[PDB]
Symmetry: D2
Subunit: 517 residues, 4 copies
């Protein structure tokens, strides 16, 4: 109890008094429920660096298949698994880490600039720039002319349209459509390098030939999660599932909502996906920048309703690419994503290319811990309660009973046994304040539950005891011992233990109140 983890604010009767009672001297618990996804790149590739990021709090390593070869990414996977497994010799402190593959998706990139792949050229504001796809001008990239790697570009944009280059920094307005070149008037000028992104706010297919190879690669190397780029409809997810094949039927598909189409068809995309990523990078270019927060809050709420994980990504701590501490806007954005109900937060260039990858992970860890305590659980739990339909599934029934029991005694943890992760996910979807300590024998499940907020996975490695009830108790004790070592639990704490009545997944039906001795 005490005056810690914003408990006075949690006991408020209105959201207004909740805000009034928030305290900067009320310290949070050590358990951080929002998972951190860190992108792998030249700054976070060495085994030595990855060990620091795992200790700092990185839960999922993201491989961005828009850059680098299959051989390059196989080296990233090997270095991650080498860093993760160096801690395995101490099972009570072992932290599982998931590997996520981010697909290239339907991209449009420019041509290499004349003079060198590492030289610059400027565009004049209000000038006249010609956009061409002619194969001859592929290496002619200059101030007056730019090449695009998308042939069917002249038959999609009307007169007066808009073409964005380099993360929406450069803007071109279509004036006339010419024979073998698109005449534009620059609307927003700026420096332009080589082979930058192009957004067109399309007939490029939903799943490319190269992304098919990329998905098979992820199955052969046993990735746990796929981030599918530019998901526009349900069949875009089915195509990714089909390319994964029966070999990868257990891989979680997280749909990236990156344009107006994805937001419009969100309901049909969410029903067929395991989760959603709000990809505010491209989404900030495909729809007006002042509206991205609407799309993020909408998508987070509907995922919290559905009980499916949602990832918030891009530019959360962007200034930390070059500076050791973030701006006030960036700290508030991470805190507010946690407040909205995000299950995971992501770092992109902050860990891939920046000079402070470990410090960015440490900052997200510190912010999320404070923000999680500031969640107004009293109204959140009540609303998730009413919105969720009645259930005859004993796992779901037990889950809500355990969460309510945890709120009643301010339990330090809910310890649940799970093989597939489902029992921990059904606890997570009701957003308990107590940490959900999930003890599993499945290494894959231990990595995959990082998607669900508040679930701390522990990989159990011992062969079964001869009496199953003894094997259950040993696993519960392993969760308590790990919680003690990691600082989640102390003597005298109350804990809720969630198990089933028989071995095998799907039989969870028991909730017990235990005190830590």
């Amino acid at each position: 109890f005490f005056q810690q983890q914003q408990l006075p604010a949690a006991m408020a009767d209105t959201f207004l008094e909740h805000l009034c009672l928030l305290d900067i001297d009320s310290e949070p618990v050590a358990a951080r429920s929002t998972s951190i996804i860190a992108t792998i790149g030249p700054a976070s590739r060495s085994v030595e660096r990855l060990k620091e990021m795992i200790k700092a709090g990185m839960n999922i390593a993201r491989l961005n298949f828009s850059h680098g070869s299959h051989e390059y990414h196989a080296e990233s996977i090997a270095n991650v698994r080498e860093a993760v497994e160096s801690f395995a010799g101490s099972p009570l402190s072992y932290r599982p880490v998931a590997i996520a593959l981010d697909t290239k998706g339907p991209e449009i990139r420019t041509g290499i600039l004349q003079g060198g792949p590492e030289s610059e050229v400027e565009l004049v504001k209000g000038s006249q720039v010609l956009v061409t796809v002619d194969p001859a001008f592929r290496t002619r990239g200059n101030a007056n002319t730019v090449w695009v790697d998308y042939p069917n570009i002249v038959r999609v944009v009307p007169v007066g349209g808009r073409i964005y280059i380099d993360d929406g920094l450069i803007s071109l307005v279509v004036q006339k459509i010419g024979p073998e070149g698109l005449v534009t008037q620059v609307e927003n000028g700026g420096v332009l390098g080589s082979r930058k992104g192009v957004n067109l706010p399309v007939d490029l297919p939903g799943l490319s030939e190269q992304d098919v190879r990329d998905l098979r690669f992820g199955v052969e190397h046993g990735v746990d999660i796929v981030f599918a780029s530019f998901v526009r409809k349900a069949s875009d997810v089915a195509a990714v599932r089909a390319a994964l094949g029966p070999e990868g039927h257990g891989i979680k598909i997280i749909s990236k909502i990156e344009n107006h189409e994805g937001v419009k068809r969100f309901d049909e995309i969410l029903e067929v996906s395991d989760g959603i990523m709000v990809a505010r990078g491209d989404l900030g270019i495909e729809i007006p920048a002042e509206k991205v927060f609407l799309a993020q809050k909408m998508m987070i709420g509907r995922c919290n309703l559905a009980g499916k994980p949602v990832v918030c990504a891009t530019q959360m701590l962007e200034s930390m690419i070059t500076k050791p501490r973030p701006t006030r806007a960036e700290t508030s954005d991470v805190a507010n994503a946690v407040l909205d109900g995000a299950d995971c937060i992501m770092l992109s260039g902050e860990t891939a290319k920046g000079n402070f990858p470990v410090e960015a992970v440490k900052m997200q860890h510190a912010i999320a811990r404070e923000a999680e305590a500031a969640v107004y659980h009293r109204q959140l739990f009540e609303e998730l309660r009413r919105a969720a339909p009645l259930s005859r599934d004993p796992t779901e029934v037990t889950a809500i009973g355990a969460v309510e029991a945890a709120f009643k005694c301010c339990a330090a943890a809910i310890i649940v046994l799970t093989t597939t992760g489902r029992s921990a996910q059904l606890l997570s979807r009701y957003r308990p304040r107590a940490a959900v300590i999930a003890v599993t024998r499945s290494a894959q499940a231990a990595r995959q539950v990082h998607l669900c907020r508040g679930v701390f996975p522990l990989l159990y490695r011992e062969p079964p005891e001869a009496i199953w009830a003894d094997d259950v108790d040993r696993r519960v004790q392993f969760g308590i011992e790990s919680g003690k070592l990691r600082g989640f639990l102390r003597v005298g704490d109350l804990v809720i233990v969630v198990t089933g009545w028989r071995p095998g997944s799907g039989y969870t039906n028991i909730m017990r109140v235990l005190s830590i001795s």
Copy 2:
């Protein structure tokens, strides 16, 4: 749907009222206990058997009249009728016996105008500016305190005043008779005591001392009957097992149009504390003479259940009326409809937030069990309990599912009738050698009894609440089961 389910789910209380349907039949068993007063109309063994089948749960002995031998016959006939069903343990219904004390009574003198009372401090307790006599018929105001006594100015005329009851509004805990009657109740093993005229905490402490250590297990229900008991209600409730709103005397001691305020205040505070509350007096008074009640009486019973009362009482309707069995049936039918019409959505929400954080594993398991019951609309919550406390902590959250309580204690089985929603089952088998099998047996006994009595069907979901070791106070386990 049935059980007024469209109304119980409504977003607002106004929409809840709008959706109440007279064609939505009640399905759950009725959870408000019926207390019937024993009298000439309900003293024979065969009539008591009729009233048990009609839904009587507690037999009230009114010690305001009758000799000790008279009440011993009442106890023997009640126990004979109750035990005639013990041949079928799966359907046996325990019936509590409650002793209602006579309490301190100020009566006038025997043998004109300006009478005297046996209470000698009447001159000191009534200041200048009212005294009611004989059920409130005569009313006197005082305008001067002199050495002879009071002035006795007549405000309302009246007659018939030989040793009649005196009430003084606005202004010991146990008479010698109550001490003897309370000893009788211990020696005859009564389960509940209705302490009359409780106005402070020391009053119920004196009842406790008269019961002695031999009667430590008896429940003490404090009857609030005057203005002082209403204003010191918080201190009274703290030391009592429950409260009875005694509207009869309360309606004389305070203005009759204020009694409903006292009733709703006390029921709310008892609901808040998780303690049983009894609403009593003239609920179906016209049925003393007529076979059907008035519209006000039928509304009165329903509103007492809606207010949150744990038990409703019948006085002359069963003690001396011509339709004692029909009066019990009428209370049963009304209570069933009223319980389904409870706006359960706001009730459970408010009880949840008002109940404070607790680290007691029984309290933690209880709220988890009630939440789990709502999530699957479980047919019942089966709980094993030695003293009934585990079943009372479930009842305090007013679940819709029945709380089926399996106990070996015959006294605790009778006493849990005070808590709304608790259906006691008396287990009679001797303990198994291994304790975990004894627990399984009792849980299955509650299942099989629930199946016979229409509580449970094959395919239903039930919430079972047990503990990790024998003895009371260790409840900590909640399980979801299918029948």
Copy 3:
């Protein structure tokens, strides 16, 4: 606000954040105000017919006099109307304390009456009994005033007699029955036939003459008995004619069909009466409170008056004090949201008609202070649709303003009563003092909870704005004299920008 002021009117329970805490804070020492908002309808009969008796009940608080046309001739009811109006107008010499009293006509409706004169036949239970269509009554057979009764009732059907006290069962098959419940049988009592569809016309030909009588004598309200469908009321309005177009029609819901078709009945009616007497026989007694609470809530949603009637204080027909069930029934009807409460035999035949009125007055005062206005107002305002009518917009603003300062009253000027009813629609705690020049509006607004009508009798001032202020002042002086207002009280004043009905649009905060 003054701390002593905060201790009355149950304001601590009003400020509670939950209904549970609202219950826990109710205080028997918290005294209410003198202004009771729930109107009292009293049935006129032998016990309440003398002019001197009507005077005592006006002072006791009777607001609407009910003529029960089930009994008595037109000449009987004309003398009743004359006596009521004489007692009412006897107070008109003092305008500031004049209490308008509405006259309500309760129709006979499709009734069925047993057989006869003042002897009494007891009836044995389980004795075979015949019901008689023959115009050619003992314990073995009795006759009835319905020739087509043999056509409708099936074998194994139930017939009720004398407030459903006696129940006949057609054990074999006029109809030879055997008795389910036996009792002392009077002369010409009531007969109810639940479940069986009767082919009796909702507007009989005697009903048409009674409604014409009410229009010719200028009654304000019609209680239409046994309304089963929307065109039952359209028939009543057609019988009233263009002359009776201003009479309020209250539909009495008395049987299962009326409850099932309640929504279409409410749409064409000015209000609803929960007629618990016949309802309690036509449907199981255990379900009446479900029907009462359903209709009160739906009327409160629709903003139309609802009356609760029958056996509220029934023991007071013979006793000077009611039972504890009766006092809580009145209180709970007010707590449910009823606009009006009714007395039947308590004032028509009983020995304590004035005391019954006084008892209902005292209970209503206590129960009105115990309403949880916080949730009631929030739910009424959330359920009411958005409006572009300035009268509705001003009304909700004035009620909210009255809650903010615990205003002693809302003073509204109204000619038709609509501005007062829209204020009453949102259930303010403050009394709605309605100043009107229309004597009929002053009578009919008693249907709306919380509205205290004042009849203004002066010719207009020549500047309309001054004429508005004189009526506001008349409202203030009247409230001061009746105890509703004191110096230093805040009052909300609701008026319009121009004369004529329909232009209310102004709310003002004034100190007394």
Copy 4:
């Protein structure tokens, strides 16, 4: 469906989130005021006119830098740009001038674990100088001291957290000066409207500022900047004596841990909403737009979440003082604020504000809540209120009505000062009083209707709520009327 009405009507906040629509366009004037700091990028009259048209409502003078003559030039340029629109009174936009005090600053002098700092006037990467003479009594053996906006830190040396390039004269942090007094006197002389009081730690700091403004600065609003741990702890006593609060995340983010700043922001905004007083969110809202034409995703959400929290004002610092896109940054804040104001869960916000607002017998307070309720009942296009000091407009703004509060006033100062209150749009009435007072009241009401029609607020057929008083002078507001245009 427009302006997020499906989201605003929802029965639960969770359903409100699910119903937010990127296609639902805002159809309502922007209610959150924009404060732009004046500096080299925004001193020219031409740039100030573009920023006025872009949405700037308050011009901030940072007295941390620049002499009195530099700031007099800034005031003159702002007023010349503002008064350039006075030719059309129906569209004239008042702009307030706010003085931001220097406060008790500590600056440095004009890598390796050993570093010496000393206050010696006779004293590179090895030795730096500071201006604070003594500090040896405030720091214990546990605390630390920060250099250069928190980038370089040192514990009780008696060189942690790295520390890169350090320049000449940058801040020093430690987790009423004579200069401040002459600055506040300067502000009274030049008729500034608002004072931002730096580093307010207790209620007596506010009394000192009010004393330095003299009896001639009675009408100047004092906004207290909560900048450190003590200001957060004694917040309630500071709020009670201030006209408003600024959450100064810049310094606050160094004085307390950066991860805790959002907690302090939400606490102060909520308490200010409770007390009905204006609160400003400040510093680094759109920092990247100093060098880039478009903001980061974090910055867009940060401005939107400040509005959703309930801030009455949002601030721009280097984005408008020194950046390369000062007009575009104002345009961006205006655009984000409009979208976020429609996304507010008005159903629960209005309910919680009304139940938290205590009962009152003041007729202005009673009229205000009646008018806001009336506005909700008809979706009034606006609430037109006549006011001399602005108090009647502030009492309406307290309840956060959906309708715009059009405040008509003769006081040029009050017109500028009500910009601190969210949803208040001031109009300055210039005509002289009519002979009959009632005609002068109606003509001001019609002035607000005419101005509202020209600006797009009002439209023929719309319903409006008009709030007036019964006698001249302030404090007598007591009338609410429903009118058709």
